[PDB]
Nucleic acid binder design. Sequence first.
RNA 1: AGUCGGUCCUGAGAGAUGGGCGAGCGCCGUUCCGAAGGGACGGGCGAUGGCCUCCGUUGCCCUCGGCCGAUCGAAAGGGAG
RNA 2: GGCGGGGGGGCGAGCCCGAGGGGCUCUCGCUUCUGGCGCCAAGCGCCCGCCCGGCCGGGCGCGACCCGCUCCGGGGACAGU
Lengths: 234, 57, 248, 68, 117
Amino acid sequence: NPLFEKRPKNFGIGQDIQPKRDLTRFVKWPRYIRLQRQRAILYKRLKVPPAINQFTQALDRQTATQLLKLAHKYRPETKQEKKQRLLARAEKKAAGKGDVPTKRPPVLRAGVNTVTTLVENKKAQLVVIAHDVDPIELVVFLPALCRKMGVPYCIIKGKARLGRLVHRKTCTTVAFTQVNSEDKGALAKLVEAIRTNYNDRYDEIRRHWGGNVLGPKSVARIAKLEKAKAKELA
Amino acid sequence: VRPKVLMRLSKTKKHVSRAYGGSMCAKCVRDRIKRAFLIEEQKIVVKVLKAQAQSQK
Amino acid sequence: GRVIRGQRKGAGSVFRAHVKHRKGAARLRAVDFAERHGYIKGIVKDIIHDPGRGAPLAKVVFRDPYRFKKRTELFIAAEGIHTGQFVYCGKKAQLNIGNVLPVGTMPEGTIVCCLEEKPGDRGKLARASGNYATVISHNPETKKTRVKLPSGSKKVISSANRAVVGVVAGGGRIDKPILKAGRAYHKYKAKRNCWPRVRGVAMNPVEHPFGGGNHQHIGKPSTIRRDAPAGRKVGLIAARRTGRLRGT
Amino acid sequence: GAYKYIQELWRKKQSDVMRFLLRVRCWQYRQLSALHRAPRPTRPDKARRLGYKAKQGYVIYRIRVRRG
Amino acid sequence: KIRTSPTFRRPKTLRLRRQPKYPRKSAPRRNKLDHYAIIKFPLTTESAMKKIEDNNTLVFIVDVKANKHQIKQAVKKLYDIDVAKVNTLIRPDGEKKAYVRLAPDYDALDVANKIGI
RNA sequence: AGUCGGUCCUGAGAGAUGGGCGAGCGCCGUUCCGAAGGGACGGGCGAUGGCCUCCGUUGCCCUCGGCCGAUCGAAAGGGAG
RNA sequence: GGCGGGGGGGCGAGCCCGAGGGGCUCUCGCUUCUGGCGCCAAGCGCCCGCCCGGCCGGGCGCGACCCGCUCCGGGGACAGU
Ligand SMILES: [Mg+2]
Ligand SMILES: [Mg+2]
Ligand SMILES: [Mg+2]
Ligand SMILES: [Mg+2]
Ligand SMILES: [Mg+2]
Ligand SMILES: [Mg+2]
Ligand SMILES: [Mg+2]
Ligand SMILES: [Mg+2]
Ligand SMILES: [Mg+2]
Ligand SMILES: [Mg+2]
Ligand SMILES: [Mg+2]
């Protein structure tokens, strides 16, 4: 109330000092940041071939969650219940002389070769490809192979997100092979939607030449160059 | 005396009672008073002169 | 043969610069925010003799706009400055002696010194005692600038670089005949051992390509081109003309 | 299944799909130091037919030499 | 998380105190430099008895790895006599002759009898 | 021998890691292509032990700490008595 | 260590129509008579256990505008190797 001033500093030039401002863009990062920061840029400068920008044409956010709840219930046997199954049924089949209390276990397969055999022999029905396997060689033969075989495939985001339905770090590929009773009706409701983007437009995905995008500093330079060149035209 | 001697002496045998005690030559003190006063008056005069420049112009 | 004198310079064995008592290098302010959008206030504390240089050497105080700290930097003492001047440096610095400011904001005809080759290298051209470049013939677009360096060859430089206005003090130093060997000797004793001008004729066959012979004469034509190997580029290196000058 | 396809895609190392992947990885390594650890082999076929079994004990040191 | 310093300095991360699982030489390597191997000879010469009459100053020969503190510890712990100061020299035949002046109480003559010199 | 000196400090220079080069023992190099501070007082919580009043010891957390690079280099320079 | 874009601003004449008003299109910005000082926030808007509508210590925002793909300039498919 009585005697409190306000002292306004003027933060201009050659006077009252500067504050502790943002300083995120202007900091000397270590060498491992500036590599991994320029590297994401470097895809966006060079013209990528169409065989590797199949990634970033990804399955959208609504569909993949519908696909993950589908993939959550063919989760393979973890080693605690792999332990528990073998210890259980061996005693059950010895007490009741159980010849087959198991008909067939349906599960998705994990790994590339466990997928690539099943795609070459038409043995799987939906193929889920991770986004981020950094040796990209492990990918660019898949979307032409599922094209020539006719098994529908989807490019999805998160190599760890494929790992969470397999109890492993990265998983790269999951092939839905033996569908359940209550789940084939779930499957064809998706494979319609997955052919709708990928398989039908294979002549379009064959010629996506991404990249060749400059920096917004030089892009704003050409946009200002349009204005004066439009001032030639006006 | 020598700088390493100066830990021994008392804190009257090392300075003068004035403000800017052992550092300014007592003529520069009574010139830093006159200079810091006469410039700060000119801050106020120009601020209210240029307030009047923002008034009638 | 033996290794000649001019080849022996390149190891830096006894030919390194006598560099202990030198008082610091002579550069400008590194280009920061304040100088590119305004000017900043600075006071010349005192001006010192930097031995190995005949120019006097200024020492300007400042205030750091980001940390509470005063910074002491070393300009080149251009002519006419005295201790206690308010050198005001930046882009919109008002054109006086000592106020370093870019060449695109001075008019053509401005006699400057310590201007820069390409912007942000802190002062390279026309630094020695009594030299001056003069900005002429601006280019409005394509931000460039013709400058007459103290040779006469109009270099065109990028126009974001700054030049302390005025000539370097120590103008007309060399007008004293040194006139005795000791004063020749002391000048180069503070610099470096570049003094022994022992002529290539007086020395032997081995140690210079001129020497030998029973009479002190060269015999070999002294115009040796720049297609020469090292330890052969002696005499007048690739001279496009020779003899005493005439007119220009 | 796929180690034949990795072999054949890395075989033709002059086509567009691979000449990008070779040229970026040639940029990728040159900014790193002289000797360091790639955590896992970047040609997982080619390490495997030389003796790499992907378990503990086996390290990859990506290493750089000057031509000429 | 607004980093107002234009350097990326190294983050202070956790550091563990060393905890070994097992000893690494099974036993403490005992001190072989006890209060017996320090003080070898008491000196008996002409000058080093003239010290003992008129100066209250016992004279010893001490191993060179000892110092002025351990001589004062060894002379008390063997002879029950106090030490005022020690004055050591590396003698130029190799040993460390150590002049020990005792307290003003204890007598240089009676102690000289009891060690025998 | 605390007070005589070496020790300590930097000078011209000599010298490792980072990095570069090299068939190679290694050389170049001294702030250069660098995640090169392990310290702080104070706030905070958490533990701990004394006389659990209050102190004392760490755990981590908010804040500063140009680290202008290690380290050697004078028995005539600097250096308390 | 404040870069380029987009917003802020009449204490601006700009460049025009035109009645308040319109931004067609610009200007850049809050330091020049003096050998002074300057940092570690004032002030506001808020949410807390506090005392019946009070009292003590804390937290955030704004004060210090939004977004963005290279630290900023300088070259450039040449130089170089
Ligand atoms: Mg001559
Ligand atoms: Mg001569
Ligand atoms: Mg001769
Ligand atoms: Mg010869
Ligand atoms: Mg491993
Ligand atoms: Mg004494
Ligand atoms: Mg090395
Ligand atoms: Mg070396
Ligand atoms: Mg030393
Ligand atoms: Mg001395
Ligand atoms: Mg002394």
